[PDB]
């Protein structure tokens, strides 16, 4: 119930929202069907339209008009945005040369430069270039301020998950808005685009920017707008708020546009019908900038022009139907379209089995355009599993396709030509970022970055402390002229032991054997030097990783590699080695195929044993430093040390061996040397965070050897590839992956073929940021470089995506 008999007189677009049953006059009252009876009349005036004309100049004020052109409109803060151009001989902002904004030029009473977020739905990254001829205002923002060639959205590349991640710095799994449709089994409640459930606060987690600002005494405009409020009224409203007295005036504002998404769905990303929506959004930007220039704020305000996701060509005929795969299609509920989420139609059906559904959906047709996953097996870079609203069964749909449950769903619901929601590394899903104003850099291009990083920067722009979030604060320092955030490196929590030779061979009873008892003061001193770390500067290029949790671990040095060996997990946390461009690949010699050697620096009690692998019929083992890349035949024996061994399913060994034997050297050849850090990851609760010892769900049979859920590698070389990775003077270049450690290769439909036809494709899908590995391991990398710490933070957030040129 709302008492709509109240009035909006003097309350139009009020900032504090009133509780029911009192009628509302704020920018969302329409969405709640709760506006006061006179809101349209008072607050949504339209008379005479949105532009001054010569004949209106100096007119007598008529309070009926949408906007004003009377002499008093500047003091009232309500002129039409083109007032000074038409009536006072001024230029449009778009026609002025740009000139660096070295310092804020703000009117008195302004405590800080205000921040205006101008968000555009569906605005694909390539519009900035492809549409530049029809977007002169946006083009001037882009060319004069700071811009990225694209910004990566979060998965799924849907609107509410991405707008809310912009607002919170959080992954969807953490903020709770995990799709445009959701079921929460704890609430037993459904969230839909249409309807009222979606307004309930329990869906929306984290702390969005307007709340962060409000708690720290920074006033905020209200961010969201009911769809029926025309864009011109939204701009006029922001400009009017900016004319409030100092103690009443917000410092942060948001505009939202439903275009170009609305037309992009109808016409496809590049339909000829798309020129007009782009023109219209550019005109809206022009209104804002002209309005700011009228208020003398155009060199005071920081403007962010930002998109939530792009838009791909998708038509009804490219739909896969689950009815063509599943016998039991009526026992499932599917959330359909550009992603699939499956759960049981009824929780009372004890014949529902996720394994049989996954198997019926796995590589069943040659050109199959989706791939099923249990959510914990999705690429860790998607960060898309740790929420009860995300169904266990996920379908990753190929770009340009849809999945649906039955054909009748698609013609009894062709209409549309565009859609979005695909994997966030897909080039069509990329979106835009431009920052313009005194706090951003002038005429500066910055590399692509993820939208999770923006909340921290918006907080820096407003002098706010960000709530805990998934950005890496400081990684976007290079966008900013001032207000940078100068993080310190985290303190190491555990210091390593450096064991020397402490055990005799006969103390070990590991069931291992090795043909290594075939035997010199020239070489003996030298092998002792290697074990004390004489080659460590070649193999550990960026300092040792720091361990940011309490554990007991040993540093182990060798000729060709260094490792941090966990006495708790019985294996390295990390192994580091450098492979120069000139390195040679060798084989594992016949006499050494089954060799595993006790490590006389590490007690039998803190070692793996070979007998556990012999008896575990599903589990085999691999090596972190690859025997294939040993520097010499003698050095190769170190690679078969029990402290270099890790548990590996035979199917996974196919992947790993190919990586080690073929790909590492390929990357060293291409990149002029690589440094590799590799290791296990344990994330049995799929939260993105390192598991403690009591969270481990699987061990090598009969032992205390934990089985990793994933294996990572971080491959670093010199950005200037004329310099070898081990003698690099400037910026670094990185790529990394987090491979799932699975007992089959059902993910790779072509896995019966030679590894050269499928392994690298698998690795690219599982591409990762260093930061993802840090969260997953409790390690902190690149601790000793010659680079600024914010530059290293940027490097740690990098994702190598393998997509062609945008
Ligand atoms: C991305 O960044 C984010 C933000 O930093 C990271 O998320 C944080 O990670 C922490 C660890 O997972 C987590 O800390 C926990 O907080 C618990 C209290 O939580 C509430 O309070 C906070 C603060 O205001 C609030 O933000 C939370 O919001 C979550 O939950 C509500 C629903 O109530 C949602 O609306 C909201 O969207 C959000 O959901 C997300 O997180 C929760 C977990 O909190 C998930 O369940 C959801 O799936 C979703 O992803 C909460 O309202 C606190 O109680 C926890 O402490 C337990 O464990 C510690 C171990 O140290 C132990 O000392 C405690 O005793 C306690 O154990 C007891 O409870 C156990 C479980 O019931 C039980 O097993 C034990 O036996 C004990 O009884 C813990 O400290 C923090 O809350 C989230 N924050 C957010 C916003 O998500 C995220 O990790 C980053 N991601 C990556 C990849 O880096
Ligand atoms: Ca859309
Ligand atoms: Ca975990
Ligand atoms: Cl969805
Ligand atoms: Na075995
Ligand atoms: Na396969």
Curated annotation (Swiss-Prot):
CDD domains: Enpp, NUC. Changing residue 159 to A: Abolishes lysophospholipase D activity. N-glycosylation, but not furin-cleavage, plays a critical role on secretion and on lysoPLD activity. The interdomain disulfide bond between Cys-363 and Cys-749 is essential for catalytic activity. Zn(2+) 2 binds at residues 261, 265, 420. Glycans are attached at residues 3, 348, 360, 470, 750. Residues 541-806 are annotated as: Nuclease-like domain. Keywords: Calcium, Chemotaxis, Cleavage on pair of basic residues, Disulfide bond, Glycoprotein, Hydrolase, Lipid degradation, Lipid metabolism, Metal-binding, Obesity, Repeat, Secreted, Signal, Zinc. 1-tetradecanoyl-sn-glycerol 3-phosphate binds at residues 159, 180, 261, 420. One of its GO terms (biological process) is phosphatidylcholine catabolic process. Ca(2+) binds at residues 683, 685, 687, 689, 691. Residues 94-447 are annotated as: Phosphodiesterase. One of its GO terms (molecular function) is phospholipase D activity. Residues 773-794 are annotated as: Required for secretion. SUPFAM superfamilies: Alkaline phosphatase-like, His-Me finger endonucleases, Somatomedin B domain. One of its GO terms (cellular component) is extracellular space. 1-hexadecanoyl-sn-glycero-3-phosphate binds at residues 159, 180, 261, 420. It catalyses: a 1-O-alkyl-sn-glycero-3-phosphoethanolamine + H2O = a 1-O-alkyl-sn-glycero-3-phosphate + ethanolamine + H(+); a 1-acyl-sn-glycero-3-phosphoethanolamine + H2O = a 1-acyl-sn-glycero-3-phosphate + ethanolamine + H(+); 1-(9Z-octadecenoyl)-sn-glycero-3-phosphoethanolamine + H2O = 1-(9Z-octadecenoyl)-sn-glycero-3-phosphate + ethanolamine + H(+); a 1-O-alkyl-sn-glycero-3-phosphocholine + H2O = a 1-O-alkyl-sn-glycero-3-phosphate + choline + H(+). Residues 4-47, 48-92 form the SMB domain. Disulfide bonds join 8-25, 12-43, 23-36, 29-35, 52-69, 57-87, 67-80, 73-79, 98-144, 106-300, 316-414, 363-749, 512-610, 514-595, 718-728. Belongs to the nucleotide pyrophosphatase/phosphodiesterase family. This is Autotaxin. The gene is Enpp2.
């Amino acid at each position: 119930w709302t008492a709509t008999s109240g009035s909006c007189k003097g309350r139009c677009f009020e900032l504090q929202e009133v509780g029911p049953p009192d009628c509302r006059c704020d920018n969302l009252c329409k969405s709640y069907s709760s506006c006061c009876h006179d809101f349209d009349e008072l607050c949504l005036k339209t008379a005479r339209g949105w532009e001054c004309t010569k004949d209106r100049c100096g007119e007598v004020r008529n309070e009926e008009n949408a906007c004003h052109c009377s002499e008093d409109c500047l003091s009232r803060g309500d002129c039409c945005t083109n007032y000074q151009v038409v009536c006072k001989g001024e230029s449009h902002w778009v026609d002025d040369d740009c000139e660096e904004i070295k310092v804020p030029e703000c009117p008195a009473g302004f405590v800080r430069p205000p921040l205006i977020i101008f968000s555009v739905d569906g605005f694909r990254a390539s519009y900035m270039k492809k549409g530049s001829k029809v977007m002169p205002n946006i083009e001037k923002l882009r060319s004069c301020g700071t811009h990225a060639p694209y910004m990566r959205p979060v998965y799924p590349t849907k609107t509410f998950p991405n707008l809310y991640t912009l607002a919170t710095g959080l992954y969807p799994e953490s903020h709770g808005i995990v799709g445009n449709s959701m079921y929460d089994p704890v609430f037993d409640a459904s969230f839909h685009l249409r309807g009222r459930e979606k307004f309930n606060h329990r869906w929306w987690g984290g702390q969005p920017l307007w709340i962060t600002a409000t708690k720290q005494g920074v006033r905020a405009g209200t961010f969201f707008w009911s769809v029926s409020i025309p864009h011109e009224r939204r701009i006029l409203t922001i400009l009017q708020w900016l004319s409030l007295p100092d103690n009443e005036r917000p410092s942060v504002y948001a505009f939202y546009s439903e275009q170009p998404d609305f037309s992009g769905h109808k016409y496809g990303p590049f339909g000829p019908e798309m020129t007009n929506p782009l023109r219209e959004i550019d005109k809206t930007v022009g209104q804002l900038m002209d309005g700011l220039k009228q208020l003398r704020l155009h060199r005071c305000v920081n403007v962010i022009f930002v998109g939530d996701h792009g838009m791909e060509d998708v038509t009804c005929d490219r739909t896969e139907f689950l009815s063509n795969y599943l016998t039991n299609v009526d026992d499932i509920t599917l959330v359909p379209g550009t992603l699939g989420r499956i759960r049981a139609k009824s929780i009372n059906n004890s014949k529902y089995d996720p394994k049989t559904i996954i198997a019926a959906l796995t590589c069943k047709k040659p050109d199959q355009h989706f791939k099923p996953y249990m959510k914990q097996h999705l690429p860790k870079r998607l960060h898309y599993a740790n929420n009860r609203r995300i169904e266990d069964i996920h379908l990753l749909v190929d770009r340009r396709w849809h999945v649906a449950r039955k054909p009748l769903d698609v013609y009894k619901k062709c209409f549309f030509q565009g859609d979005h929601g695909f994997d966030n590394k897909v080039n069509s899903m990329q979106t835009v970022f431009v920052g313009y104003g005194p706090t951003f850099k002038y005429r500066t291009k910055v590399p692509p970055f993820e939208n999770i990083e923006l909340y921290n920067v918006m907080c820096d722009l407003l002098g706010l402390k960000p709530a805990p979030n998934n950005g890496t604060h400081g990684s976007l320092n290079h966008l900013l002229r001032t207000n940078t955030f100068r993080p310190t490196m985290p303190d190491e929590v555990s210091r390593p032991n450096y064991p020397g030779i402490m055990y005799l061979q006969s103390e070990f009873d590991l069931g291992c054997t090795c043909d290594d008892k075939v035997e010199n003061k020239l070489e003996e001193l030298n092998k002792r030097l290697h074990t004390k770390g004489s080659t460590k500067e070649r193999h550990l290029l960026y300092g040792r990783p720091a361990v940011l949790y309490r554990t007991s671990y040993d540093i182990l040095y060798h000729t060709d590699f260094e490792s941090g060996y966990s006495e708790i997990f019985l294996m390295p946390l990390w192994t580091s080695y450098t492979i120069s461009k000139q390195a040679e690949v060798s084989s594992i010699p016949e006499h050494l195929t089954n060799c595993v050697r006790p490590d006389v620096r590490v007690s039998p009690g803190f070692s793996q044993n070979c007998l556990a692998y012999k008896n575990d019929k599903q589990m085999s083992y691999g090596f972190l430093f690859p025997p294939y890349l040993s520097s010499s035949p003698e050095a190769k024996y170190d690679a078969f040390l029990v402290t270099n061994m890790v548990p590996m399913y035979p199917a996974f060994k196919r992947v790993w061996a190919y990586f080690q034997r073929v790909l590492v050297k390929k990357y060293a050849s291409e990149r002029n040397g690589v440094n590799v850090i590799s290791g296990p990851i344990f994330d049995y609760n799929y939260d993105g965070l390192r598991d403690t010892e009591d969270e481990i769900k699987q061990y090598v049979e009969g032992s205390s050897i934990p089985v990793p859920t994933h294996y990572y590698s971080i491959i670093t070389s010199c950005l200037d590839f004329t310099q070898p990775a081990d003698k690099c003077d400037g910026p670094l270049s990185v790529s990394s992956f987090i491979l799932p450690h699975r007992p089959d290769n059902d993910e790779s439909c072509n896995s019966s073929e030679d590894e050269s036809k499928w392994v690298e494709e698998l690795m690219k899908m599982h591409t990762a940021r260093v930061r993802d590995i840090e969260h997953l391991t409790g390690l902190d990398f690149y601790r000793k470089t010659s680079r600024s710490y914010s530059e290293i933070l940027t490097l740690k957030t990098y994702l190598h995506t393998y997509e062609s040129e945008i």
